[PDB]
From TrEMBL:
Record bears the keyword Lyase: no
Keywords assigned by UniProt, alphabetized: Calcium, Metal-binding, Zinc
Protein's name according to its UniProt entry: Cereblon isoform 4
Domain CULT residues, every copy: 4-107
């Protein structure tokens, strides 16, 4: 393999994204934010991610990224919750905000 830095689903090993695809939303790819119950999520933003399935309809409620609606993104292979897909925005129109602790960075 290439050894290129990629992110795998911690639960099943599926390749989900690459360090090359980190996206600095608002100036940083990492956003330490909270779900509505006060649990911290260290979210890493990516311009592209693979192997995900979206569930439900997009919502604007509690959106961490002003102007974007979110949808839950699961691993399409094992069903584990890996983060959210954001859409309806300006630049970029869509992106992924993934939970860093749900992924494992490693060599491709
Ligand atoms: O931008 C977003 C992403 C989704 N999100 C969220 C919403 C509800 C729940 C309930 C448990 N974890 C949640 C996370 C949020 O607050 N903002
Ligand atoms: Zn998985």
């Amino acid at each position: 393999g290439s050894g290129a830095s990629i992110f795998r689903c911690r639960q099943c090993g599926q390749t989900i994204s690459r360090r090359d695809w980190l996206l600095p939303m608002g100036g940083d790819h990492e956003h330490v934010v909270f779900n509505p119950h006060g649990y911290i999520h260290r979210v890493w933003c990516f311009s592209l991610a693979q192997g995900l399935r979206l569930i439900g309809a997009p919502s604007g409620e509690h959106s961490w990224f002003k102007g974007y609606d979110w949808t839950i993104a699961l691993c399409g292979q094992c069903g584990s919750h890996l983060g959210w897909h954001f859409e309806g925005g300006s630049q970029p129109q869509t992106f992924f905000g993934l939970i860093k602790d749900a992924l494992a960075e490693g060599p491709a």
